[PDB]
Amino acid sequence: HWGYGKHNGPEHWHKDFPIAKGERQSPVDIDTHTAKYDPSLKPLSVSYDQATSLRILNNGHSFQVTFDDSQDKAVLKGGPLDGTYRLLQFHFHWGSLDGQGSEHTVDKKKYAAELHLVHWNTKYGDVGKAVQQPDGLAVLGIFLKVGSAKPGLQKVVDVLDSIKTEGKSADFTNFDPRGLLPESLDYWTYPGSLTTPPLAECVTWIVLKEPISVSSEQVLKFRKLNFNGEGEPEELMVDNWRPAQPLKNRQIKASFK
Numbered sequence: 109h110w111g112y113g114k115h116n117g118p119e120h121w122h123k124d125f126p127i128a129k130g131e132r133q134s135p136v137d138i139d140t141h142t143a144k145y146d147p148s149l150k151p152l153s154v155s156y157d158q159a160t161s162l163r164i165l166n167n168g169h170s171f172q173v174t175f176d177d178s179q180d181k182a183v184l185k186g187g188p189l190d191g192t193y194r195l196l197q198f199h200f201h202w203g204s205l206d207g208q209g210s211e212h213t214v215d216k217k218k219y220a221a222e223l224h225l226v227h228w229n230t231k232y233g234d235v236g237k238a239v240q241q242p243d244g245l246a247v248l249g250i251f252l253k254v255g256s257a258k259p260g261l262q263k264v265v266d267v268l269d270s271i272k273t274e275g276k277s278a279d280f281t282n283f284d285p286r287g288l289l290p291e292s293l294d295y296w297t298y299p300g301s302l303t304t305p306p307l308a309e310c311v312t313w314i315v316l317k318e319p320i321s322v323s324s325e326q327v328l329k330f331r332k333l334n335f336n337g338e339g340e341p342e343e344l345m346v347d348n349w350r351p352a353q354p355l356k357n358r359q360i361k362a363s364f365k
């Protein structure tokens with residue numbers, strides 16, 4: 109089964125998921141001098157006021173906070189998107205050191221981590237149908253750099269002790285994902301894929317220009333999680349990021365000048 113080690117990491121994924129070598133794989137490097145400002149792009153609409161978080165979980169690949177997506181409660185709209193996309197979950201990718209961990213890069217710069225808020229297009233009815241469509245998902249990507257603490261992240265960080273190993277989950281209601289956003293919603297956008305198996309090419313990526321800052325104590329808490337399940341040799345959950353993939357016949361558009 110897949111992971112991020114020498115023998116099961118991103119260089120192996122194509123054997124079970126041959127779309128790993130596809131025409132619209134993610135993440136990619138964002139060359140800021142080649143992305144074109146697109147004035148036709150609208151502002152993004154992030155409507156998270158009615159978000160209903162449910163649980164926090166260690167899935168062996170990362171940790172995730174899940175939301176009730178049975179109604180339009182927390183939706184992403186506008187920007188490059190047609191229609192309404194409901195927030196399903198968010199999770200992160202992070203490094204063993206502050207100089208690596210993000211999946212997207214910006215002029216080859218790697219950030220310490222990257223947040224993915226995962227949304228699906230309601231015209232397809234359920235997430236499973238949406239993953240089979242080229243416009244099925246929209247993932248909002250936010251870079252993390254190490255500096256000042258992010259107060260809106262601290263409730264996440266303080267429960268990680270309780271889901272140390274894969275398969276563990278905990279109640280995590282009443283969490284406000286608005287506390288994870290930077291000030292600016294300036295973004296880059298391009299068509300891409302899931303960055304973990306099945307690597308489906310179903311994602312409109314929206315990557316925010318402005319990173320959020322998190323403290324060294326907060327990211328250290330990410331790094332104490334485990335890939336393994338309880339009672340198995342401890343392998344720290346670090347460097348759970350896929351590297352940049354070929355851009356091929358794609359063009360990255362910027363919402364700003």
Ligand SMILES: Cc1cc(C)cc(NC(=O)NCCS(=O)(=O)Nc2ccc(S(N)(=O)=O)cc2)c1
Nearest residue numbers: 174175176196197224226239247301302303304
């Ligand atoms: C059944 C149920 C219910 C609720 C509420 C949440 C969940 N959690 C969930 O579905 N997680 C993944 C959905 S996926 O699209 O199939 N996988 C995927 C997503 C994003 C990326 S990424 N790294 O490109 O952002 C990579 C892979 C499940």
Ligand SMILES: [Zn+2]
Nearest residue numbers: 199201224303
């Ligand atoms: Zn992700």
